């Protein structure tokens, strides 16, 4: 499982107990688990259980959730995207972020 | 993709163009692709495209399809299972089959 | 396939023939298969078929199932979790 600061879950629209994909930019590993809420404002991203074989402290990851919907909705759907930098500082747009 | 004798698809209830999981008993590889119908009575199992990196002629595989349904139906659902031996000879039950 | 003591399936809400994810704490491997019922009280967890390449006897694993539902219901959904230790002894 992956414990995630509740503020981050809210920004990405991800629910506690929702299925998530984690794609490890650092090492290339890809794995699917579920979300666990960590305390709001903790800025925690914690890989728990077997998932700890797939990421290490300091790894840069992308955490995604997927939903299903009919085609017409899909065609106008806008994902909830949160961008990070630094000490897991959240931003609304990619335009803020260093190299 | 995996091309499969249409008689085998009928027995397992698998549709042309349906998503399938292939679990390689021989080498342990696991992969997801889709079904392609091969000529009825050909007894073909053909791994095509990138899937050819995951299985070789002579490998023993399990090919599964999954469907979704509400819980109450799920609780009484009976899968369509076809058992093989020899020259891809199909049987209805496991009780026929050598070691 | 993975055969699992029916007591354990009952506690986790996992159904015979349901899709399951298996996450191997011992060796890190992750795979998806389906659940088979094993005799009630046996404490069995048996990896069968090609899955025998992904886990060995004595490996510690997490076995999970997933369901879909609309967002409104998902917000309050509560998963069925069973905890184990020792020789597959449930409730701690």
């Amino acid at each position: 499982x992956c414990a995630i600061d509740q503020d981050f879950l809210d920004a990405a629209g991800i629910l506690e107990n929702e299925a998530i994909d984690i794609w490890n930019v650092t090492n290339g590993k890809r794995f699917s688990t579920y979300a666990i809420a960590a305390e709001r404002g903790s800025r925690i991203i914690s890989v728990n259980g077997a998932a700890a074989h797939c990421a290490s402290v300091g790894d840069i990851v992308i955490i995604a959730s997927f939903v299903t919907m009919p085609d017409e909705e899909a065609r106008t759907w806008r994902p909830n995207v949160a961008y990070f930098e630094g000490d897991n500082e959240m931003k609304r747009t990619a335009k803020a972020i260093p190299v | 993709x995996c091309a499969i004798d249409q008689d085998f698809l009928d027995a397992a209830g698998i549709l042309e163009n349906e998503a399938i999981d292939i679990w390689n008993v021989t080498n342990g590889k696991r992969f997801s692709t889709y079904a392609i119908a091969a000529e009825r009575g050909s007894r073909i199992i053909s791994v095509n495209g990138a899937a050819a990196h995951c299985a070789s002629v002579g490998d023993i595989v399990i090919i599964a399809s999954f469907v979704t349904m509400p819980d109450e139906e799920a609780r009484t659902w009976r899968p369509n299972v076809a058992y093989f031996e020899g020259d891809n000879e199909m049987k209805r039950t496991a009780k026929a089959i050598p070691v | 396939x993975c055969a699992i003591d029916q007591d354990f399936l009952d506690a986790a809400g996992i159904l015979e023939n349901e899709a399951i994810d298996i996450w191997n704490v011992t060796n890190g491997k992750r795979f998806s298969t389906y659940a088979i019922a094993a005799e009630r009280g046996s404490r069995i967890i048996s990896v069968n078929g090609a899955a025998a390449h992904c886990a060995s006897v004595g490996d510690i694993v997490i076995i999970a199932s997933f369901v879909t539902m609309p967002d409104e219901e998902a917000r309050t959904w509560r998963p069925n979790v069973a905890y184990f230790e020792g020789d597959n002894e449930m409730k701690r």
Partner: peptide, 25 residues
Amino acid sequence: SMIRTMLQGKLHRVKVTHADLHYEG
């Protein structure tokens, strides 16, 4: 109309007791 995939349940830290590559069923 937006459908979520949610953890239904889990068996946490069970031990594998048997492995059977040649299983028929």
